[PDB]
Short mmCIF file of C-alpha atoms in Angstrom, two decimals:
data_model
loop_
_atom_site.label_atom_id
_atom_site.label_comp_id
_atom_site.label_asym_id
_atom_site.label_seq_id
_atom_site.Cartn_x
_atom_site.Cartn_y
_atom_site.Cartn_z
CA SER H 1 22.78 -17.99 3.42
CA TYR H 2 22.22 -21.07 1.23
CA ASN H 3 20.47 -18.83 -1.30
CA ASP H 4 23.66 -16.77 -1.79
CA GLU H 5 25.33 -20.00 -2.90
CA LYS H 6 22.37 -20.60 -5.24
CA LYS H 7 22.56 -17.06 -6.58
CA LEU H 8 26.28 -17.15 -7.29
CA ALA H 9 26.18 -20.59 -8.92
CA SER H 10 23.06 -19.75 -10.95
CA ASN H 11 24.65 -16.63 -12.44
CA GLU H 12 27.68 -18.73 -13.42
CA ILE H 13 25.33 -21.15 -15.18
CA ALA H 14 23.64 -18.15 -16.87
CA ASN H 15 27.04 -17.03 -18.20
CA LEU H 16 27.44 -20.21 -20.28
CA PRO H 17 26.68 -19.58 -24.00
CA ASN H 18 26.10 -23.16 -25.28
CA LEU H 19 23.36 -24.75 -23.14
CA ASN H 20 19.78 -25.13 -24.39
CA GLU H 21 16.78 -24.29 -22.22
CA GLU H 22 16.32 -27.91 -21.14
CA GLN H 23 19.90 -28.16 -19.91
CA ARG H 24 19.90 -24.79 -18.18
CA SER H 25 16.73 -25.84 -16.37
CA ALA H 26 18.29 -29.13 -15.33
CA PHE H 27 21.39 -27.56 -13.73
CA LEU H 28 19.52 -24.65 -12.16
CA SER H 29 16.96 -27.01 -10.58
CA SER H 30 19.79 -29.13 -9.14
CA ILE H 31 21.33 -25.99 -7.68
CA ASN H 32 17.88 -25.00 -6.37
CA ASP H 33 17.56 -28.44 -4.70
CA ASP H 34 21.03 -28.64 -3.16
CA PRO H 35 23.43 -25.67 -3.30
CA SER H 36 26.29 -27.63 -1.71
CA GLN H 37 26.54 -29.45 -5.06
CA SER H 38 27.41 -26.17 -6.85
CA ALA H 39 31.13 -26.75 -7.39
CA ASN H 40 30.28 -30.12 -8.94
CA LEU H 41 27.32 -28.96 -11.03
CA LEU H 42 29.32 -26.04 -12.46
CA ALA H 43 32.12 -28.37 -13.46
CA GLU H 44 29.53 -30.57 -15.20
CA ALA H 45 27.89 -27.60 -16.92
CA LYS H 46 31.23 -26.20 -18.14
CA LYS H 47 32.20 -29.58 -19.57
CA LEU H 48 28.85 -29.91 -21.35
CA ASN H 49 29.03 -26.32 -22.57
CA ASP H 50 32.50 -26.84 -24.06
CA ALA H 51 31.48 -30.07 -25.75
CA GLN H 52 28.66 -28.14 -27.44
CA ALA H 53 30.88 -25.28 -28.61
CA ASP O 1 15.92 -17.53 10.72
CA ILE O 2 17.55 -14.19 9.83
CA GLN O 3 15.88 -11.07 11.24
CA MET O 4 16.59 -7.37 10.73
CA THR O 5 16.13 -4.29 12.86
CA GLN O 6 15.92 -0.90 11.15
CA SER O 7 16.67 2.42 12.73
CA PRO O 8 15.25 4.81 13.14
CA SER O 9 11.69 3.49 12.87
CA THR O 10 10.44 7.05 12.26
CA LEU O 11 12.46 9.88 10.78
CA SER O 12 11.60 13.53 10.10
CA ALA O 13 13.85 15.66 7.91
CA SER O 14 13.58 18.82 5.81
CA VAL O 15 13.74 18.92 2.00
CA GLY O 16 17.36 18.82 0.84
CA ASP O 17 18.54 17.00 3.99
CA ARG O 18 20.70 13.92 3.73
CA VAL O 19 19.01 10.92 5.35
CA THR O 20 20.43 7.58 6.50
CA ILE O 21 18.58 4.41 7.47
CA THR O 22 20.42 1.43 8.90
CA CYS O 23 19.47 -2.22 8.84
CA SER O 24 21.23 -4.69 11.13
CA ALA O 25 20.76 -8.40 10.51
CA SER O 26 20.94 -11.14 13.13
CA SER O 27 23.53 -12.97 10.99
CA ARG O 28 25.67 -12.31 7.90
CA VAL O 29 23.92 -12.07 4.53
CA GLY O 30 25.67 -11.61 1.19
CA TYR O 31 23.27 -8.87 0.05
CA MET O 32 20.70 -6.44 1.42
CA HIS O 33 17.80 -5.07 -0.63
CA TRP O 34 15.53 -2.10 0.02
CA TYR O 35 11.92 -1.33 -0.84
CA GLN O 36 10.04 1.97 -0.87
CA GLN O 37 6.32 1.94 -0.13
CA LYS O 38 4.16 5.00 -0.72
CA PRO O 39 0.72 5.40 0.93
CA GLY O 40 -1.82 3.05 -0.66
CA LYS O 41 0.70 1.46 -3.01
CA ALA O 42 2.68 -1.77 -3.26
CA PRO O 43 6.36 -1.82 -2.31
CA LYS O 44 8.69 -0.87 -5.15
CA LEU O 45 12.27 -2.13 -5.49
CA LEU O 46 14.63 0.74 -4.69
CA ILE O 47 18.09 -0.69 -4.03
CA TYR O 48 19.12 -4.26 -4.78
CA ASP O 49 22.31 -6.27 -4.27
CA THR O 50 23.19 -3.79 -1.49
CA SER O 51 24.16 -0.79 -3.66
CA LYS O 52 22.56 -1.21 -7.10
CA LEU O 53 19.84 1.23 -8.17
CA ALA O 54 16.57 -0.29 -9.35
CA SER O 55 15.11 1.11 -12.54
CA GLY O 56 13.36 4.48 -12.32
CA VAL O 57 15.32 5.31 -9.17
CA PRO O 58 17.12 8.70 -9.02
CA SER O 59 20.85 8.97 -8.30
CA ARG O 60 19.75 10.59 -5.04
CA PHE O 61 19.46 7.04 -3.63
CA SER O 62 22.43 4.89 -2.63
CA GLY O 63 23.07 1.85 -0.46
CA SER O 64 26.05 0.41 1.36
CA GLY O 65 27.23 -2.21 3.81
CA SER O 66 28.27 -5.80 4.32
CA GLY O 67 28.04 -8.60 6.85
CA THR O 68 25.25 -7.72 9.24
CA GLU O 69 25.24 -3.91 8.87
CA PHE O 70 23.69 -2.14 5.88
CA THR O 71 22.57 1.42 5.18
CA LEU O 72 20.32 3.20 2.70
CA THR O 73 21.12 6.87 2.00
CA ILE O 74 19.02 9.58 0.32
CA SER O 75 21.35 12.46 -0.60
CA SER O 76 18.74 15.21 -1.10
CA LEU O 77 15.40 14.42 0.51
CA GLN O 78 12.51 15.43 -1.78
CA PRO O 79 8.79 15.71 -0.98
CA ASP O 80 8.13 12.61 -3.10
CA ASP O 81 10.45 10.60 -0.85
CA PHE O 82 7.68 10.51 1.75
CA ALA O 83 7.34 6.77 2.31
CA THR O 84 8.09 3.77 4.49
CA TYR O 85 11.33 2.05 3.56
CA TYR O 86 11.99 -1.66 4.25
CA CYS O 87 15.20 -3.64 4.05
CA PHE O 88 14.85 -7.25 2.83
CA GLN O 89 17.08 -10.33 2.77
CA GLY O 90 16.72 -13.22 0.34
CA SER O 91 19.87 -14.99 1.46
CA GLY O 92 18.06 -17.53 3.64
CA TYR O 93 14.54 -18.91 4.08
CA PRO O 94 12.24 -17.63 5.41
CA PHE O 95 12.77 -14.41 3.47
CA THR O 96 12.39 -11.51 5.88
CA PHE O 97 11.89 -7.73 6.00
CA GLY O 98 13.02 -5.16 8.53
CA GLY O 99 10.33 -3.45 10.58
CA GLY O 100 10.26 -0.40 8.30
CA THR O 101 11.28 3.25 8.61
CA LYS O 102 8.63 5.92 8.03
CA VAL O 103 10.23 9.03 6.49
CA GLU O 104 8.34 12.28 7.09
CA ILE O 105 9.12 15.66 5.54
CA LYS O 106 9.63 18.81 7.62
CA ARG O 107 8.43 22.04 6.00
CA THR O 108 7.36 25.59 6.82
CA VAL O 109 4.16 25.99 8.82
CA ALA O 110 0.99 26.30 6.72
CA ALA O 111 -2.48 27.28 7.94
CA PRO O 112 -5.49 25.16 6.92
CA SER O 113 -8.19 26.38 4.58
CA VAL O 114 -11.43 25.43 6.32
CA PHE O 115 -14.59 24.41 4.47
CA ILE O 116 -17.97 23.12 5.58
CA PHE O 117 -20.49 20.98 3.72
CA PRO O 118 -24.04 20.62 5.05
CA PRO O 119 -25.93 17.31 4.71
CA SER O 120 -27.00 16.63 1.12
CA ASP O 121 -30.76 16.51 0.58
CA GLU O 122 -30.41 12.97 -0.75
CA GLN O 123 -29.17 11.81 2.65
CA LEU O 124 -31.73 13.76 4.66
CA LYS O 125 -34.42 11.61 3.04
CA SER O 126 -32.91 8.39 4.37
CA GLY O 127 -33.31 10.08 7.75
CA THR O 128 -29.66 10.69 8.60
CA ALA O 129 -27.41 13.74 8.36
CA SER O 130 -23.66 14.12 8.20
CA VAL O 131 -22.04 17.55 8.31
CA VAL O 132 -18.48 17.60 7.02
CA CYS O 133 -15.77 19.97 8.19
CA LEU O 134 -12.62 20.02 6.05
CA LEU O 135 -9.18 21.37 6.94
CA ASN O 136 -7.07 21.51 3.78
CA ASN O 137 -3.32 21.56 3.17
CA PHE O 138 -1.80 22.49 6.51
CA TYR O 139 1.40 21.73 8.38
CA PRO O 140 2.21 20.45 10.90
CA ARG O 141 -0.20 17.56 11.47
CA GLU O 142 -1.38 18.65 14.94
CA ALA O 143 -4.78 20.39 14.89
CA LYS O 144 -7.98 20.69 16.95
CA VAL O 145 -11.53 20.64 15.59
CA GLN O 146 -14.64 21.14 17.75
CA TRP O 147 -18.31 21.00 16.81
CA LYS O 148 -20.89 23.45 18.15
CA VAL O 149 -24.60 23.06 17.46
CA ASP O 150 -26.49 26.16 18.63
CA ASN O 151 -23.44 27.27 20.63
CA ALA O 152 -23.37 23.93 22.45
CA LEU O 153 -20.10 22.01 22.22
CA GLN O 154 -20.46 18.44 20.94
CA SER O 155 -18.86 15.17 22.05
CA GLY O 156 -18.65 11.62 20.76
CA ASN O 157 -20.84 12.20 17.71
CA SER O 158 -18.02 13.10 15.32
CA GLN O 159 -15.07 11.28 13.75
CA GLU O 160 -11.81 12.58 12.31
CA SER O 161 -9.59 11.28 9.52
CA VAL O 162 -6.25 12.65 8.34
CA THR O 163 -4.43 12.07 5.08
CA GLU O 164 -0.83 10.97 4.80
CA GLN O 165 1.61 13.79 3.94
CA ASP O 166 1.18 15.00 0.38
CA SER O 167 3.91 13.79 -2.01
CA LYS O 168 4.15 17.28 -3.62
CA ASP O 169 3.79 19.94 -0.91
CA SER O 170 4.25 17.76 2.18
CA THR O 171 1.02 19.03 3.76
CA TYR O 172 -1.83 17.20 5.47
CA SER O 173 -5.57 17.49 5.22
CA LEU O 174 -8.18 16.46 7.75
CA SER O 175 -11.94 15.81 7.73
CA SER O 176 -14.26 15.83 10.75
CA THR O 177 -17.75 14.35 10.29
CA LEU O 178 -20.67 15.08 12.64
CA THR O 179 -23.37 12.41 12.39
CA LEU O 180 -26.94 12.96 13.58
CA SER O 181 -30.30 11.38 12.87
CA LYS O 182 -32.44 13.61 10.64
CA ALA O 183 -34.54 14.20 13.76
CA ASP O 184 -31.95 15.80 16.03
CA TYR O 185 -30.64 17.61 12.96
CA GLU O 186 -33.86 19.54 12.38
CA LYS O 187 -34.01 20.19 16.13
CA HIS O 188 -31.23 22.79 15.96
CA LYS O 189 -30.43 25.82 13.80
CA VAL O 190 -26.76 26.87 13.53
CA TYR O 191 -24.10 24.27 12.70
CA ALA O 192 -20.50 25.31 13.25
CA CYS O 193 -16.99 23.87 13.02
CA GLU O 194 -14.27 25.48 15.15
CA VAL O 195 -10.62 25.01 14.18
CA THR O 196 -7.39 25.68 16.07
CA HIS O 197 -3.94 25.45 14.47
CA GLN O 198 -0.41 26.80 14.86
CA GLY O 199 -0.73 28.56 11.51
CA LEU O 200 -3.80 30.48 12.68
CA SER O 201 -3.53 33.57 14.88
CA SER O 202 -7.04 32.97 16.20
CA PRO O 203 -9.40 29.94 15.95
CA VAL O 204 -11.35 29.94 12.69
CA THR O 205 -15.05 29.07 12.67
CA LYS O 206 -17.08 27.89 9.67
CA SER O 207 -20.87 27.65 10.09
CA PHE O 208 -24.27 27.58 8.38
CA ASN O 209 -27.99 27.92 9.19
CA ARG O 210 -30.26 24.92 8.67
CA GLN Q 1 7.00 -5.46 -19.29
CA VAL Q 2 6.10 -7.48 -16.21
CA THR Q 3 2.86 -7.08 -14.31
CA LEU Q 4 1.20 -9.19 -11.61
CA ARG Q 5 -2.36 -8.99 -10.32
CA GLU Q 6 -3.83 -10.62 -7.18
CA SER Q 7 -7.48 -11.64 -6.96
CA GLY Q 8 -9.69 -13.39 -4.40
CA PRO Q 9 -12.49 -12.72 -1.89
CA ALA Q 10 -12.47 -9.42 -0.01
CA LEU Q 11 -14.08 -11.14 2.95
CA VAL Q 12 -13.75 -14.58 4.55
CA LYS Q 13 -15.12 -16.03 7.79
CA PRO Q 14 -12.97 -17.30 10.67
CA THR Q 15 -11.94 -20.98 10.22
CA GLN Q 16 -12.53 -20.81 6.46
CA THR Q 17 -9.83 -21.37 3.87
CA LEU Q 18 -8.69 -18.41 1.75
CA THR Q 19 -7.83 -18.90 -1.94
CA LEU Q 20 -5.82 -16.18 -3.66
CA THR Q 21 -4.81 -16.16 -7.31
CA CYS Q 22 -1.90 -14.33 -8.88
CA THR Q 23 -2.19 -13.75 -12.65
CA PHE Q 24 0.93 -12.41 -14.34
CA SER Q 25 2.36 -11.34 -17.69
CA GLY Q 26 5.69 -10.24 -19.13
CA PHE Q 27 7.39 -13.44 -18.02
CA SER Q 28 6.79 -17.19 -17.89
CA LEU Q 29 6.96 -19.54 -14.93
CA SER Q 30 8.22 -22.26 -17.28
CA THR Q 31 11.36 -20.19 -17.78
CA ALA Q 32 14.40 -21.64 -16.03
CA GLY Q 33 15.15 -19.86 -12.77
CA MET Q 34 11.78 -18.10 -12.45
CA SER Q 35 9.64 -17.81 -9.28
CA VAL Q 36 6.54 -16.16 -7.84
CA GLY Q 37 6.23 -15.40 -4.12
CA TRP Q 38 3.49 -14.08 -1.82
CA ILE Q 39 3.90 -11.41 0.85
CA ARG Q 40 1.26 -9.84 3.11
CA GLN Q 41 0.94 -6.70 5.21
CA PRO Q 42 -1.57 -6.32 8.04
CA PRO Q 43 -2.90 -2.76 8.65
CA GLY Q 44 -0.07 -0.59 9.97
CA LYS Q 45 2.41 -3.45 10.23
CA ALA Q 46 5.52 -4.63 8.41
CA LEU Q 47 5.64 -6.86 5.35
CA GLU Q 48 5.80 -10.61 5.96
CA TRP Q 49 6.91 -13.12 3.32
CA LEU Q 50 4.54 -16.15 3.13
CA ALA Q 51 5.57 -18.55 0.36
CA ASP Q 52 7.17 -19.02 -3.03
CA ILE Q 53 7.06 -21.48 -5.93
CA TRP Q 54 9.70 -22.08 -8.60
CA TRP Q 55 9.60 -23.07 -12.26
CA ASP Q 56 10.74 -26.55 -11.17
CA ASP Q 57 7.78 -26.84 -8.78
CA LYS Q 58 9.99 -26.40 -5.70
CA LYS Q 59 8.04 -24.61 -2.90
CA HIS Q 60 8.94 -22.80 0.34
CA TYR Q 61 6.68 -21.66 3.21
CA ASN Q 62 7.26 -19.33 6.15
CA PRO Q 63 7.21 -21.34 9.44
CA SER Q 64 5.33 -18.43 10.99
CA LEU Q 65 2.28 -19.62 9.03
CA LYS Q 66 2.28 -22.94 10.89
CA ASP Q 67 1.82 -25.24 7.88
CA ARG Q 68 -1.39 -23.43 6.88
CA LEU Q 69 -0.12 -22.68 3.34
CA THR Q 70 -0.34 -24.45 -0.01
CA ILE Q 71 1.05 -22.89 -3.22
CA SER Q 72 0.63 -24.22 -6.79
CA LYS Q 73 1.11 -23.02 -10.37
CA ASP Q 74 -0.57 -23.25 -13.76
CA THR Q 75 2.25 -22.28 -16.13
CA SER Q 76 -0.15 -22.52 -19.04
CA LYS Q 77 -2.37 -19.71 -17.69
CA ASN Q 78 0.33 -17.64 -15.93
CA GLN Q 79 -1.35 -18.17 -12.56
CA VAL Q 80 -0.10 -19.07 -9.09
CA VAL Q 81 -2.61 -19.96 -6.40
CA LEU Q 82 -2.07 -19.64 -2.66
CA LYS Q 83 -4.38 -21.21 -0.10
CA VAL Q 84 -4.47 -20.35 3.58
CA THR Q 85 -6.40 -22.60 5.98
CA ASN Q 86 -8.19 -21.66 9.16
CA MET Q 87 -8.32 -17.89 8.66
CA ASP Q 88 -8.26 -15.67 11.74
CA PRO Q 89 -8.79 -11.90 12.08
CA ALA Q 90 -5.01 -11.74 12.65
CA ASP Q 91 -4.70 -12.69 8.94
CA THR Q 92 -6.58 -9.55 7.87
CA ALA Q 93 -4.09 -7.94 5.50
CA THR Q 94 -3.25 -6.81 2.04
CA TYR Q 95 -1.81 -9.75 0.07
CA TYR Q 96 0.80 -9.24 -2.69
CA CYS Q 97 2.35 -11.53 -5.27
CA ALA Q 98 5.73 -10.67 -6.82
CA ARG Q 99 8.32 -12.10 -9.19
CA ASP Q 100 11.66 -13.51 -8.09
CA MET Q 101 14.46 -15.28 -10.01
CA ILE Q 102 17.16 -17.65 -8.83
CA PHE Q 103 19.71 -15.19 -10.23
CA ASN Q 104 18.31 -12.50 -7.92
CA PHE Q 105 16.64 -13.61 -4.68
CA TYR Q 106 14.80 -10.31 -4.46
CA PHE Q 107 11.26 -9.44 -5.58
CA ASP Q 108 11.77 -7.02 -8.44
CA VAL Q 109 8.14 -6.57 -9.56
CA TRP Q 110 5.03 -6.70 -7.33
CA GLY Q 111 1.29 -6.78 -7.90
CA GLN Q 112 -0.97 -3.98 -6.65
CA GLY Q 113 -2.14 -6.16 -3.79
CA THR Q 114 -5.56 -7.43 -2.82
CA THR Q 115 -7.14 -6.72 0.54
CA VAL Q 116 -8.61 -9.52 2.63
CA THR Q 117 -10.63 -9.10 5.79
CA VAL Q 118 -11.42 -11.98 8.16
CA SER Q 119 -14.73 -11.34 9.93
CA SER Q 120 -18.07 -12.90 10.74
CA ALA Q 121 -19.81 -9.65 9.82
CA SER Q 122 -21.47 -9.60 6.40
CA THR Q 123 -20.85 -7.49 3.29
CA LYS Q 124 -22.54 -4.09 3.09
CA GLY Q 125 -22.52 -1.64 0.19
CA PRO Q 126 -21.87 2.09 0.44
CA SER Q 127 -24.25 4.96 -0.01
CA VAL Q 128 -22.59 7.73 -2.02
CA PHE Q 129 -23.64 11.33 -1.32
CA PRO Q 130 -22.76 14.69 -2.93
CA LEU Q 131 -20.45 17.16 -1.25
CA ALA Q 132 -21.54 20.05 -3.44
CA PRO Q 133 -19.25 23.05 -3.77
CA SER Q 134 -20.69 26.33 -2.43
CA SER Q 135 -19.64 29.77 -1.22
CA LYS Q 136 -18.78 27.96 2.04
CA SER Q 137 -16.15 25.67 0.45
CA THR Q 138 -14.38 28.44 -1.47
CA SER Q 139 -10.95 29.97 -0.82
CA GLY Q 140 -9.77 32.29 -3.58
CA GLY Q 141 -9.72 31.33 -6.33
CA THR Q 142 -10.67 27.75 -5.54
CA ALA Q 143 -13.67 25.67 -4.48
CA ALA Q 144 -13.66 22.26 -2.80
CA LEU Q 145 -16.22 19.58 -3.60
CA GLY Q 146 -16.39 15.82 -3.14
CA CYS Q 147 -18.32 12.63 -2.37
CA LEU Q 148 -19.21 11.05 0.96
CA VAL Q 149 -19.04 7.23 0.90
CA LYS Q 150 -20.81 5.94 4.00
CA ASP Q 151 -21.80 2.68 5.72
CA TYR Q 152 -19.81 -0.03 3.96
CA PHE Q 153 -17.96 -3.24 4.82
CA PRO Q 154 -15.36 -4.58 4.38
CA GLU Q 155 -12.61 -2.38 3.00
CA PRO Q 156 -11.68 -1.18 0.49
CA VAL Q 157 -13.40 1.54 -1.46
CA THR Q 158 -11.68 3.20 -4.42
CA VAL Q 159 -12.55 6.66 -5.71
CA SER Q 160 -11.48 8.28 -8.96
CA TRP Q 161 -12.61 11.61 -10.43
CA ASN Q 162 -13.71 12.08 -14.05
CA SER Q 163 -12.64 8.55 -14.95
CA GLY Q 164 -9.12 9.32 -13.77
CA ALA Q 165 -8.77 12.54 -15.79
CA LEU Q 166 -8.89 14.66 -12.62
CA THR Q 167 -5.97 13.92 -10.27
CA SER Q 168 -4.54 17.23 -9.04
CA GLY Q 169 -6.12 18.43 -5.78
CA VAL Q 170 -7.90 15.18 -4.88
CA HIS Q 171 -7.81 13.99 -1.25
CA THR Q 172 -9.52 10.67 -0.51
CA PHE Q 173 -9.47 10.22 3.27
CA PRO Q 174 -8.66 6.92 5.03
CA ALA Q 175 -11.87 5.19 6.08
CA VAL Q 176 -12.95 5.43 9.69
CA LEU Q 177 -14.76 2.65 11.51
CA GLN Q 178 -18.07 3.85 12.93
CA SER Q 179 -19.63 2.40 16.09
CA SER Q 180 -22.15 0.57 13.90
CA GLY Q 181 -19.11 -1.44 12.80
CA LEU Q 182 -19.20 0.01 9.29
CA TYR Q 183 -16.68 2.18 7.44
CA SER Q 184 -17.13 5.67 6.03
CA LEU Q 185 -14.82 7.95 4.06
CA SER Q 186 -14.92 11.12 1.97
CA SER Q 187 -13.13 12.14 -1.19
CA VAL Q 188 -12.67 15.81 -2.02
CA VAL Q 189 -10.98 17.86 -4.70
CA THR Q 190 -10.27 21.55 -5.09
CA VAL Q 191 -10.80 23.07 -8.54
CA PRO Q 192 -10.98 26.59 -9.95
CA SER Q 193 -14.23 28.31 -8.99
CA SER Q 194 -14.49 29.56 -12.59
CA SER Q 195 -14.88 25.97 -13.79
CA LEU Q 196 -17.99 25.31 -11.67
CA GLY Q 197 -20.20 26.24 -14.62
CA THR Q 198 -18.28 24.70 -17.51
CA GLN Q 199 -16.63 21.53 -16.18
CA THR Q 200 -18.57 18.45 -15.07
CA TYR Q 201 -17.16 16.77 -11.96
CA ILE Q 202 -17.99 13.12 -11.31
CA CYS Q 203 -16.76 10.80 -8.54
CA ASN Q 204 -16.48 7.17 -9.60
CA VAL Q 205 -16.91 4.98 -6.53
CA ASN Q 206 -16.07 1.29 -6.51
CA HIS Q 207 -16.82 -1.04 -3.63
CA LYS Q 208 -15.84 -4.31 -5.25
CA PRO Q 209 -16.63 -6.41 -2.16
CA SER Q 210 -20.35 -5.65 -2.66
CA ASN Q 211 -20.17 -5.33 -6.46
CA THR Q 212 -21.18 -1.67 -6.15
CA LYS Q 213 -20.22 0.93 -8.77
CA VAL Q 214 -21.55 4.48 -8.58
CA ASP Q 215 -20.77 7.48 -10.78
CA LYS Q 216 -22.12 10.54 -8.94
CA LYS Q 217 -22.11 14.00 -10.52
CA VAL Q 218 -21.31 16.71 -7.95
CA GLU Q 219 -22.58 20.22 -8.75
CA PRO Q 220 -23.27 23.62 -7.09
#
């Protein structure tokens, strides 16, 4: 059920309004590679999102 | 890996019946998805994320479940629901499908219209002859078709084929083809197809003279 | 909207490698989160997932295929290619490609599928013969007529009527394998008897494996 972790985390990345396509691709690919890093990657995405608000 | 067993594997219900198909997975998945596959067509997404309706899917369809046990429900079985349904999990690799559930429609008995086509002249030139008997739009599927050439029953020189249930009237049709070299063909006179079916009071014969 | 279309040989010999191509539109495989996967279905059996590829070039393969698979993409041309080594008659199946997304993990759009047969036997084209309507194929009211497509290999054969304009009443029967090792099927359609004189009826027969196309007019 590693893909359920991917799916949940990926939708949370999709929810972020301020990432460009390059950045979305970066985080999604990292999630795709290793779902156990989701909590960390989301934190990183949210921080980057907010800095680009 | 994660595997799924569906039940039942075959299901027969009347129009308007409520139908339920279950899918049990070998281990917990977060979601179950369902596909509908009509005869000769690719699977089409029907239910996704366990209970969400895919686009172009009537409110008739619904899905439920969690953990290892999931169900698909059709609240008013229609003729066009004739299909095989598959559950599918994408929660772990390899992705897997259940074994499928073929849903058949029960309906009122219907006698076949019987037709016979002699060998076309075009074929007779090539030196072969096929005589085609056709039973059209009948229910149920069970039927018997025997060939008689000059009153003599035939064996092993004919082949049958039956359609899948029609998506509109839930009937079947069936063709039986008798194949003979042009030689043996012009060696006999009357060619006849004999048909037996529940919807017929007595066996119907369709014939022609060479 | 999204469409996918599979292409490749209809027939391959045992031990040979199969190459299938999926060409798609309505989406891009350079889009973040996007994927294409391949699924097959042997005659009368369940669907089996084979492989997938992601926009980031990540790939997965079903262990059941014993490392026989290679998948690749050309994002430029909207194509995904799947190769299968060492084909066996057990691999005879219809092969489908379909779109997935990392937000979904379900295949939401599929191609029409492409049929592959693994056999040493060689390609053979159909003969198409008239099944002319007559007093003997009339009920009512209604007359049946059709086309007999005989002696071909491998599957499949497709039959339309009147370039697709005629759909109601058509039955194209599943092919049957003859003892010669070749397939044969019929297609038939019931129409009003009163149209026999005024309406032209033509069966369009395609056997793509042998590059055969035949438009036969069927008349009384």
